């Protein structure tokens, strides 16, 4: 079961927050909850639908963080000519994933953007 | 050896910046059709980064271009490269249907055509070919 | 058990979608279904037949000539012969006006059974497969 | 280069208008007095030379080059990671050809019949 202000779906508890935060601050806010939580993860379409039913009333059209960060690191970048990728000069930016409180489709956002969020833990 | 007409020498390679706007894949294909088989430029040192930035800056026709393709390409097959959620679970379900691939590298006008950025592969932009003549 | 809209065969669930999408977008669409499906892999004659039947029963697919399945070439090259018949390696190549065929499809002319390689960016119906 | 063959950068070339499939053309090249192969292109300049050579008698005929079975060796895999044990491919092979007036490559069925050019090192 779920504490007051949280909602239950298949053994987990979920709560949306409106306070805009960057990804790292949002994830930390969930981690500071009395039951240590995380930004929402989606394991199914039915789970995503439930979550947007939660966000729709108060988060509305706001962007909402989900628990995937730095999505362009780990892509196994290589040179088309087969040269060694030893020298590096990437811009220092990272992107994280978000959804709209209205829709389940994912969106890439700069990790320093401030968005609403939803926290999740297992009951 | 010897760079052909239109190509610029730096170290042991020849280079050319093209203002023809092409997707990353078309640009790489076009480079492979030049001379003895060029490719989108690899950048392997600070001096080569300086050189490529200068070369793009020398191209009058590239005055209003925001991005210029170079040969950086992600090899991971996934459409986003985080395979674990912050909660530790593996990514299976994904809802990327509205989004487009960002797994190609470019130089960008905003930062002087020096720092690498990733951008959308299917967008048409200017590009630079690098050749080892032979 | 399969969910609504899906058809069971030998421990997996299948659905043919009539929405025409590129191979990549079709695969992305499958990943957004249920607990993350993929384009169908075909691992036996019996599965090959069932998927053919599944396609044949989609009335919306009557005008459709190719249907995407999950076969994808992993080689980065635009054509997969790395040597000329004379033994020399391929470096120069002029593939500028040619589209590559690095994705696998089932085809109406051959009864949606035999695999054919085809152009990834062409827009076609597709079949998803999952474990329920 | 010997009589009937044309020289370019240390190699010898000869065009043939007799339509053959890819394998029969390649075999024919191998069976000439100087053992040769279907033409290979190592640069754009070489492709330009060959097209100059073909244009007069082959014209807009498709002309084979020495690349065969171009869709084999692509490391085909399933997007879901299943083993590719069972195979149900259509039996078809493609090979590359060029038009006798332009340097752009075209993928063709290897059993189509085209003109061709042979090549050997002098």
Curated annotation (Swiss-Prot), chain B:
Q: By its UniProt entry, which Gene3D superfamilies does this protein fall under?
A: Mannose-Binding Protein A, subunit A
Superkingdom of origin organism: Eukaryota
- C-type lectin domain boundaries: 10-130
For this chain, the annotated S-S bridges are 3-14, 31-129, 104-121
The signal peptide stretch is none
**Record keyword Disulfide bond present:** yes
Q: Which GO terms describe its cellular component?
A: extracellular region
**Per the UniProt entry, what are the Gene Ontology biological process annotations, in alphabetical order?**
regulation of cytokine activity
Q: Where in the cell is it found?
A: Secreted
Which key words are in the record? Answer: Disulfide bond, Hemostasis impairing toxin, Metal-binding, Platelet aggregation activating toxin, Secreted, Toxin
Tissue specificity here reads: Expressed by the venom gland.
Query: Could you cite one Gene Ontology molecular function of this protein?
Result: toxin activity
Q: Name one Pfam family in it.
A: Lectin_C
Stated family: Belongs to the snaclec family.
- Subunit annotation: Dimer (non-covalently linked) of heterodimers of subunits alpha and beta (disulfide-linked).
- PANTHER family in alphabetical order: MANNOSE, PHOSPHOLIPASE, LECTIN RECEPTOR RELATED (PTHR22803)
What is this protein for, i.e. what is its function? Answer: Elicits platelet aggregation by the binding to the C-type lectin domain family 1 member B (CLEC1B/CLEC2). Binding leads to tyrosine phosphorylation in the cytoplasmic tail of CLEC1B, which promotes the binding of spleen tyrosine kinase (Syk), subsequent activation of PLC-gamma-2, and platelet activation and aggregation. Binding to GPIbalpha (GP1BA) and alpha-2/beta-1 (ITGA2/ITGB1) may also induce aggregation, but this is controversial.
The protein, known as: Snaclec rhodocytin subunit alpha
Q: Which organism encodes this protein?
A: Calloselasma rhodostoma (Malayan pit viper)
**What lineage does the source organism belong to?**
Eukaryota, Metazoa, Chordata, Craniata, Vertebrata
From Swiss-Prot, chain C:
Q: Where in the cell is it found?
A: Secreted
Q: One GO term of the cellular component aspect?
A: extracellular region
User: Does the keyword Disulfide bond feature in the UniProt annotation?
Assistant: yes
Q: Which cysteines are joined by disulfide bonds?
A: 2-13, 30-128, 103-120
The UniProt entry, under SUPFAM superfamilies, shows:
C-type lectin-like (SSF56436)
- Pfam families, per database record: Lectin_C
Instruction: Give residue ranges for domain C-type lectin.
Output: 9-129
The UniProt keyword set, sorted, is: Disulfide bond, Hemostasis impairing toxin, Metal-binding, Platelet aggregation activating toxin, Secreted, Toxin
Q: Please give the Gene Ontology molecular function terms for this protein.
A: metal ion binding; toxin activity
Its main subcellular localisation, reduced to a broad class, is secreted
Q: In which tissues is it expressed?
A: Expressed by the venom gland.
Its GO biological process annotations read: regulation of cytokine activity
Q: Does the entry feature the keyword Zinc, yes or no? A: no
The similarity annotation says:
Belongs to the snaclec family.
**Assembly mode:** Dimer (non-covalently linked) of heterodimers of subunits alpha and beta (disulfide-linked).
**Role, per record:** Elicits platelet aggregation by the binding to the C-type lectin domain family 1 member B (CLEC1B/CLEC2). Binding leads to tyrosine phosphorylation in the cytoplasmic tail of CLEC1B, which promotes the binding of spleen tyrosine kinase (Syk), subsequent activation of PLC-gamma-2, and platelet activation and aggregation. Binding to GPIbalpha (GP1BA) and alpha-2/beta-1 (ITGA2/ITGB1) may also induce aggregation, but this is controversial.
PANTHER family named in the record: MANNOSE, PHOSPHOLIPASE, LECTIN RECEPTOR RELATED (PTHR22803)
Which protein is depicted?
A: Snaclec rhodocytin subunit alpha
Swiss-Prot record, chain D:
**Similarity section:** Belongs to the snaclec family.
Q: What S-S linkages are listed for this chain? A: 1-12, 29-118, 95-110
**Could you say which residues of the full protein are shown?**
25 to 146 of 146
Keywords, alphabetical: Disulfide bond, Hemostasis impairing toxin, Metal-binding, Platelet aggregation activating toxin, Secreted, Signal, Toxin
- What name goes with this protein? Snaclec rhodocytin subunit beta
Q: Which GO terms describe its molecular function?
A: metal ion binding; toxin activity
Major subcellular site: secreted
Where does this protein reside within or beyond the cell? Secreted
The job of this chain, per UniProt, is described as: Elicits platelet aggregation by the binding to the C-type lectin domain family 1 member B (CLEC1B/CLEC2). Binding leads to tyrosine phosphorylation in the cytoplasmic tail of CLEC1B, which promotes the binding of spleen tyrosine kinase (Syk), subsequent activation of PLCgamma2, and platelet activation and aggregation. Binding to GPIbalpha (GP1BA) and alpha2/beta-1 (ITGA2/ITGB1) may also induce aggregation, but this is controversial.
The superkingdom listed in its UniProt entry is Eukaryota
The keyword DNA repair belongs to this UniProt entry's keyword annotation = no
**Complexes and interactors:** Dimer (non-covalently linked) of heterodimers of subunits alpha and beta (disulfide-linked).
In which tissues is this gene expressed?
Expressed by the venom gland.
A GO-annotated cellular component: extracellular region
């Amino acid at each position: 079961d779920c504490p007051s202000g949280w909602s239950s779906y298949e053994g987990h508890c979920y709560k949306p927050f409106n306070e805009p935060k960057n990804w790292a601050d949002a994830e930390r806010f969930c981690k500071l909850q009395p039951k240590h939580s995380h930004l929402v993860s989606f394991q199914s379409a039915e789970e995503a639908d439930f979550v947007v039913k939660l966000t729709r009333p108060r988060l509305k059209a706001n962007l909402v963080w989900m628990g995937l960060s730095n999505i362009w690191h780990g892509c196994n970048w290589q040179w088309s000519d087969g040269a060694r990728l030893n020298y590096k000069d990437w811009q220092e930016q990272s992107e994280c994933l978000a959804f709209r409180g209205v829709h389940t489709e994912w969106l890439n956002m700069d990790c320093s953007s401030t968005c609403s969020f939803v926290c999740k833990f297992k009951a | 050896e010897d760079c052909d007409f239109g190509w610029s020498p730096y170290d042991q390679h020849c280079y050319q910046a093209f203002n023809e706007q092409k997707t990353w894949d078309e640009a790489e294909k076009f480079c492979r059709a030049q001379e003895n088989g060029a490719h989108l430029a690899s950048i392997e040192s600070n001096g080569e980064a300086d050189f490529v930035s200068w070369l793009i800056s020398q191209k009058d026709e590239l005055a209003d271009e925001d991005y210029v393709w170079i040969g950086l390409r992600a090899q991971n097959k996934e459409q986003q490269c985080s395979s674990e959620w912050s909660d530790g679970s593996s990514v299976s379900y994904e809802n990327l249907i509205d989004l487009h691939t960002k797994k190609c590298g470019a130089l960008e006008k905003l930062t002087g055509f020096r720092k690498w950025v990733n951008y959308y592969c299917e967008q048409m932009h200017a590009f630079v070919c690098k050749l080892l003549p032979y």
